[PDB]
Amino acid sequence: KPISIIGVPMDLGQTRRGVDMGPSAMRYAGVIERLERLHYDIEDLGDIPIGKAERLHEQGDSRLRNLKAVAEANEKLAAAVDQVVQRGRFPLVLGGDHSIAIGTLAGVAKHYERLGVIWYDAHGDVNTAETSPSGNIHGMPLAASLGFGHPALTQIGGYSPKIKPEHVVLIGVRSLDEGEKKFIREKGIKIYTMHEVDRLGMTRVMEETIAYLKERTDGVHLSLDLDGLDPSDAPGVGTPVIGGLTYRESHLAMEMLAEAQIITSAEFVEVNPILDERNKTASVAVALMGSLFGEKLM
Amino acid sequence: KPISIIGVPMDLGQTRRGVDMGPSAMRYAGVIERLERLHYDIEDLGDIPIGKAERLHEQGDSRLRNLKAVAEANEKLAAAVDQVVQRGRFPLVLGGDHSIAIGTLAGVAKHYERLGVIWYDAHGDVNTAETSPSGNIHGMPLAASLGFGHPALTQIGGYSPKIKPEHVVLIGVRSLDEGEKKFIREKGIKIYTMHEVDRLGMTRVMEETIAYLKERTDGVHLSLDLDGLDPSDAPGVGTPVIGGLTYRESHLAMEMLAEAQIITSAEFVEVNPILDERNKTASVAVALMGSLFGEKLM
Amino acid sequence: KPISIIGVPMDLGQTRRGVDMGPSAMRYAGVIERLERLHYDIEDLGDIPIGKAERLHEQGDSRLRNLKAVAEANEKLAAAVDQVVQRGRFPLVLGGDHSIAIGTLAGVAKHYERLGVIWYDAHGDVNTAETSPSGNIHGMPLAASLGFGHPALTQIGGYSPKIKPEHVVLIGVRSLDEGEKKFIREKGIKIYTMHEVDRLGMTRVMEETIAYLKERTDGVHLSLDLDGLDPSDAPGVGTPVIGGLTYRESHLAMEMLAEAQIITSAEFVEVNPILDERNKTASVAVALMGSLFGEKLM
Amino acid sequence: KPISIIGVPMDLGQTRRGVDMGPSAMRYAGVIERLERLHYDIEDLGDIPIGKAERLHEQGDSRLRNLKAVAEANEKLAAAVDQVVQRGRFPLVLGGDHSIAIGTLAGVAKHYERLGVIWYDAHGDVNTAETSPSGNIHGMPLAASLGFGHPALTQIGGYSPKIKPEHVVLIGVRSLDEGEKKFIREKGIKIYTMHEVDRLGMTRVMEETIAYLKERTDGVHLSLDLDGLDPSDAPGVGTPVIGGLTYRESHLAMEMLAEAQIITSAEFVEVNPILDERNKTASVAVALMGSLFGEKLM
Amino acid sequence: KPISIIGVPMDLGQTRRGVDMGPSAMRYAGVIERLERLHYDIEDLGDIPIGKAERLHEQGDSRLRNLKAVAEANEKLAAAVDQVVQRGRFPLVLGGDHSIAIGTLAGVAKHYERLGVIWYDAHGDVNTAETSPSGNIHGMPLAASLGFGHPALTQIGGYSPKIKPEHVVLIGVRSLDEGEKKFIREKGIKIYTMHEVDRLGMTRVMEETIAYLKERTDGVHLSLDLDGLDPSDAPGVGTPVIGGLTYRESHLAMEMLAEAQIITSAEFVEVNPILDERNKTASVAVALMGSLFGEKLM
């Protein structure tokens, strides 16, 4: 299936500037060339125009920083993504902080009876204005897409929820706020924290993950946050957490998903060139994209 | 169970100065805060006064450097640890080179019918004045505790031995002197060198270890030497050995022990701030302690 | 005098992508805050729209890569810069590769009887299509501004030349092509290579430079290329050259210029976040700007 | 069985100079001392005289660079190795780029009814003048040994092929040329790329490998290319490829081979002191040799 | 003149923990051995007992954090230093944060008609409760010793001021608060910020400094703050500032003072092992002490 790249230069979902440079950092890391080599009909639809956020002061919720700019950008993203899917193409969204997942899922989900989600991340991203300790919207996209949160975020695309909790699998988690641990526990979301990764091994985690979703979804969206990898492998992220997944574990995961042929959409987020070591993180993202799309060693 | 921290600023067990700053480096790394967050009644009993060693030439044995000072300090430690156990608390000892294990086990063992020991280390620490290639007492605490060595070390606390060989499990070993290899073989001590860890995996090593000790002990003392971790993960150690356990393997181990609920006392040794990279090692120790005491990602 | 910031996201002057992110990396490095603190009326006019280069094979000259896009973007820059000068403000241009100097000088020069130029760089940037060993226009802005080269570059702004050779001072040079060595020698351009900086000292080089230009110009434009600093100090540059000026030498230079009150316009170029170590270079640029604009330690 | 060391200061198999210093770097890394400690009768037969290759433009060799010099050096190596085997000694060849495998296998294979080969590498080394993308002979030794390629290479030692495809096992492969992927596919060579290593684990890979060859060979030659390890573990290699085998995985592999007692000859190649970090790579090689030859932690 | 070392394990003058380990970090870096080699009668009087500070809450001034504990420790220090001077020995105080300068000068000054001070630092340390932006007493010792500040600090030793502004020379300054710039300007304190160091050179700065003080003092106290050096040379400091003095500039300074024979007392402060890279900073301090005390290359 032909691919369509959409860049979302977003940084309003959090506070470290530079994550808005992720789309071009990955383009510069050679994402087009990489995918063209795999004989893909790759197309670059450019970037979603993001508006500058109103200053905190006259702005409404500190528990929902930059809500309007974030909500509007995601509206545009949802539309762009919706059209790509309608055109029969695979939407590959490049971020940008994780709050863009709200728009990506808003444009994809409407097209599936039961869309599953693989949330590759160090965080759960299931906070609300009530549970969020930062007010950073990049820490709320999964909950908002599950129908939990401010209507400005939950109603993107004119419908909700975008997905069901039983159709979500979290991988590489190692930093959850108390409210989030409770949310995960109660909504019954499937999750493999680093303990399970260390205990079971990435192979078993991926096998179980793929089998689980394949048995109850009709499309799977890969929401890959680069901070899911160890800061040593992916240094250029705004909210890094030590003791993460390795470069190899990430490739195996992508390779196993490629093989499974279950990934119907994807987004690579949180790449921040301004916090990286010579574009290393964008590079990792591009390599991981290659594996996801079927690149093989043999 | 409430915890009691006892710092043992000891460096007389070896030759690299600075390991005596380990207790405070770990305190500065945030051990109290870490444990309080887990809802523990934590208490800091301060440090064991360590005397200074007498003139080397007017000392008794070259194969037992600083024997007088090491033996006396361990006497004090044993008493302090004994008291804590009597009070119904968990003794958490912060070192300090590994020679302090002699005092810790001396105050703990007397309280158990069959105390088991998990020795997480790159070394076996089963040398005697005869087999020791250095004369460094930090390389003799396990043998001494098993009743093998100079009476000045074997009789700490007025009894011996503190433990039985069949109740000991060595993990992470990758540097044994010939005499020690023979000792381990002959005393029949259970051991998982890096080969076994590489071959079986930390999960299997921990499963087997926990099952073994649980089936024949009434209390388990964790003697964790930071040099058990690779120098890249734990640079601040006096006698580093490459090709060690990773940060993740160490957390999984602690996590599986917490789960097992078998650890009745513990000590984290060999942290040397003066050989470290910005208190990295003291930090690792504190994090591993959090896991040991039940900290979880989810 | 109020300042006006103009970003020129240009990378068509050379081949390393990412230098187009220099303007925003410097903004993120805090250029506005830095200057506001010095009590300046600072204004950000945004960025100059840069078009994309046409197919290489259907381009006109290999010795003048991306001539069309580079020349047109420089036209826009010249206009913007011209306007700022007319408004009574100081034009502070943020790049972007060094080819943007062509546009900056084009909008500034017309306003001075004898505009002088201080070219802080590891290179001379005095190549033509004939002498250029790369075809990279970022290696031709000084010659072009002096009236030497392709008319598409020499006629920007509708006039030429922008400056006279006798009003130019090169500082920090350590990498000149043969053609350029000849050019400098023959046009009689004042130059202080690293040898002179090492032999005389930055203080003497700056004293001599300031005295020279002050005695025969009515305005001085500072064209500061970050690669003028050693790659250890400024790692984020496309064409680094070892054995460059230090961080301290650069601050002293800016500090002595501020003192002299001779700089009437400036530009900081070649900052490439994608080749940097955590925005270090953009940071250096911002600090040097603070000094240029009068920031003092006491 | 007594060991005989033969250094092959070869770099004509590729383009990065310095790999000819590999033999002395490893000797200086202490190969003799290491092996003597395991009570071996170790002997150093010095180095094979390598003749400088004539100008590429003068002698016909571009898809086969330095063919004459590489073919003759390998002739000498073949003889030296043949003689060592005849004397009842184990031939331990120290390289030198991988093209020397052609000579080593040429001197060993004639002595076995069915010699197996474990090719520990990031590459397949199964290119021919037709499929080679570089013309570097170090990328053709395995194919040439299997009887595929220029006669100057396939006929070394007066016979061919030296081995059969079904008796070859590739391990750690992560960089194969298209022609090579096809070669491996069609010749039916058993291969464990990094995907299999990540998926199955080194233990499994080694178990399967040892059992496979043990069931159908009468001798097994270990051709270990240091670039099979990750560049972070083995930095001093000419053609590094990221996402490689770890230090520990390599020790386990060597340890399990020692155990199986199947390795009848070996060569450690691609060590280049001039691209390394303080002889780190030669050191890893020496250590790995210690394990291969039975060195144990316990 | 014989030397007497007094360690002041102080960290209450600021907020980064670990600076209290500076005395032993320097002892471990070999300060005694170093000075003994220069044939000195060196004596170690141990450490000043420092009391733990009352918690901020019930504590008085936030503008004067830990005032009572800091004031009391300095009382003890002043007494210890006073006696050393009385015994005809040179007081060498090892810190500990800079707030200890209050006690050192309190014990020395009473013994001189006109005691001069060389304040080697990145900061001015001339803040008061009114001008301090942090409330950190380590940022007030020079002003307090000049008679400016809270009486609890200005009256240490029962007299004030300890020195006159005209007898003070600041060197390496590059980070002054506004109040401090004003204080320096108005009290007329002689100061060489990094601008003067870069402009004049360390040699001229030291020549001018030595001549100035020698012409109007009867004793000179060297208050050396390790953060006066660049964080690359002295990484282990709590409040580092980039663009500092080099290792060589520091040795030249010490060498030139040794030669001048004007230093009658000294203290090396701010060494923090917990923020350093393998005791590098304590090491630099010990080497600098060697030069100060006459160690020479020839």
Added chain:
Amino acid sequence: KPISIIGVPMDLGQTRRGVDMGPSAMRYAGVIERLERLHYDIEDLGDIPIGKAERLHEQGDSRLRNLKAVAEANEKLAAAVDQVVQRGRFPLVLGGDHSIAIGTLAGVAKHYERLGVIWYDAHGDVNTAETSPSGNIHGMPLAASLGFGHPALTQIGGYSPKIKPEHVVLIGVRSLDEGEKKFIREKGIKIYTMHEVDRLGMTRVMEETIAYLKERTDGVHLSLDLDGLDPSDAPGVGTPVIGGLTYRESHLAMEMLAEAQIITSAEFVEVNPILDERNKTASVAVALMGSLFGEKLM
């Protein structure tokens, strides 16, 4: 004047192995290409055959380790160098540890009425068997050349002394043994330790040096030891000493010597690839040679 390169793969002058690889490391660092570009008639005479030194316990040489092998290799070097000078060529010797200076000066000095020597080093190399603290002959070449030491070393070439003390200038010295300090003092050798370099500046030191020797010699031999540069600039050296000359100071020195046209012979020693960071040190050497031979920035 045409240049003749002679490699001397010597490491018997000290204990760190690998320095025998210095000649090829520099050749690989591009010494020929570098010099040819300056339009020189460069010729490579290969390497001097060095014989392995017999066991320390078997042949009498401990205050003079490897004396036989070092004395004879230097005999051969002396002849080779003598012949090059006779042919009217400039002898450029590539080492190899510093003991090779004995042979170089032995072949050059006989051709000059008053040969001067610039000894660029961190050491003085003026030890004798009596004063040597190591027994390493690389610490005795200058004394031996001045006619002080074992006859096996002082009589190389059939004559002595090769030079007079008043015609020697040491530069960059920062590590002298007591006997050496006395030797320099008494023989009245002109010396610029790092104190003088820091105090006067490299320009001044070089000006004074050139003028001194130019006024009283008829030829000047440059004996450049790479360890004269700081270990950060030249890491690959066996006996590094911190606080050394910078890369720039070395280039200025070489540049000023080229200018003076006084250097009639030279040798670059102590390059050890096995202790370096990717041939960095050989590279600095090559670069420094380029300058010495007239390479210029402009």
